[PDB]
Amino acid sequence: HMYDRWFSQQELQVLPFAEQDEQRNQTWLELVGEAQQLMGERCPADEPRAIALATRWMEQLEQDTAGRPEFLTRLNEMHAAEPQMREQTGVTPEMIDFITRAFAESKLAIWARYLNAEELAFTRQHYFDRLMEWPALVADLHRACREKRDPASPEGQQLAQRWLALFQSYAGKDAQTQQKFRYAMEQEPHLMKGTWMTSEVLSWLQQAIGVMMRQ
Ligand SMILES: COc1c(NC(=O)c2ccc(NC(=O)c3ccc(NC(=O)[C@H](CC#N)NC(=O)c4ccc(NC(=O)/C(C)=C/c5ccc(O)cc5)cc4)cc3)c(OC)c2O)ccc(C(=O)O)c1O
């Protein structure tokens, strides 16, 4: 069976997808069907119904990957190389592209209340520049936070430096603009959806960042 080709026996017991729960399958049946309908209509990704659908997708996908970023990246490996993936899930790379942009717009809608028009335009473009590098970083942050790596060590500062590079990629290099983004996240729970980040890993990261920013 399909997940057994990609997950160890121990991983399979903590992977919700591997349950073939009937209710979970029906939920994804509806999520896929709704995405198919919006795509076939060429629905713009910033329409409310698209943003709402993408928000549901990310909520469900985080739950069904057990909140483990490494399980998310395993699914991405399957979308690239598992022949049965479309047949078994109904999810396609084109569909994922639509959800990705609608989920981006779900965050741009919130950032619009904190940024001016020129900052919003910059981020609407550059949000996508390095977006797909975040799951690898999140996995490396989970491992670091797990092993109580010193946030101030060279290995911790390399992680903070990788965060800054991905953050400045979407936010820009302006200090006042960056502070708007950091304030918005503190104020808006939706901005940390679709991240696989936990309060524990965020604390570890924000300690590493704080060391980087004061120095
Ligand atoms: C806000 O910024 C910050 C931060 N920020 C962050 O830490 C931060 C962290 C991470 C992130 N991002 C991510 O991790 C991230 C980025 C990209 C992705 N993408 C993917 O994985 C890609 C594409 C995209 N996209 N694949 C998918 O989506 C994907 C979609 C669906 C499936 N589905 C299936 O296989 C199914 C359903 C099977 C099935 C089965 C059975 C069935 O019956 C039917 C179906 C599989 C994969 C996902 C997550 C982020 O966002 C950029 C952040 O901002 C931190 C601190 C501060 C501060 O201020 O201190 C701050 O400001």
Query: Candidates 31, 192, 206: which one to mutate for ligand 1, based on the most atoms within 8 Å of Cβ?
Result: 192
What is the torsion angle, in degrees rounded to the nearest 10, for the CA atoms of residue 190, residue 72, residue 83 and residue 51?
Answer: 0
Query: Candidates 134, 185, 188: which one to mutate for ligand 1, based on the most atoms within 8 Å of Cβ?
Result: 134
Residue among 90, 85, 18, 11 nearest 57 (CA): 90
Check whether residue 212 and residue 153 sit in a common domain. Answer: yes
Check whether residue 102 and residue 19 sit in a common domain. Answer: yes
Query: Phi and psi for 208 in degrees, rounded to 5?
Result: -65, -40
Task: Please check whether residue 182 lies inside any domain of the structure.
Answer: yes
- Any atom of ligand 1 within 6 Å of the Cβ of 185: yes
Taking the centre of ligand 1 as the mean of its atom positions, its distance from the CA of residue 135, in whole angstroms, is 7
Check whether residue 106 and residue 177 sit in a common domain. Answer: no
Check whether residue 50 and residue 7 sit in a common domain. Answer: yes
Under 8 Å between Cβ of 3 and 65: no
Residue that is written with structure tokens 């741009």 in the block: 108
For the record, the structure tokens of 52 come out as 């709402």
- Give the number of C-alpha atoms closer than 13 A to the C-alpha of residue 151, restricted to the C-beta side: 19
Residue among 78, 89, 76, 63 nearest 194 (CA): 63
Check whether residue 3 and residue 106 sit in a common domain. Answer: yes
Taking the centre of ligand 1 as the mean of its atom positions, its distance from the CA of residue 197, in whole angstroms, is 10
C-alpha span between 121 and 117 (Å, rounded): 6
**Structural domains of the chain, count:** 2
For the record, the structure tokens of 191 come out as 């901005």
Residue nearest to atom 41 of ligand 1 (CA): 89
Check whether residue 10 and residue 86 sit in a common domain. Answer: yes
Experimental approach was X-ray
Check whether residue 153 and residue 190 sit in a common domain. Answer: yes
Q: Which atom of ligand 1 is nearest to the CA of 127?
A: 52
Give me the resolution in angstroms, 1 decimal.
1.7
Task: Please check whether residue 172 lies inside any domain of the structure.
Answer: yes
Check whether residue 136 and residue 107 sit in a common domain. Answer: no
Check whether residue 85 and residue 137 sit in a common domain. Answer: no
Which range marks the domain in which residue 203 is found? 132-215
Domain end, chosen from 77, 111, 145, is at: 111
Taking the centre of ligand 1 as the mean of its atom positions, its distance from the CA of residue 195, in whole angstroms, is 5
* Other residues' Cβ atoms within 10 Å of the Cβ of residue 66: 14
Identify the sign of the CA torsion 33, 47, 183, 124. Answer: positive
Rg (CA), the chain: 18
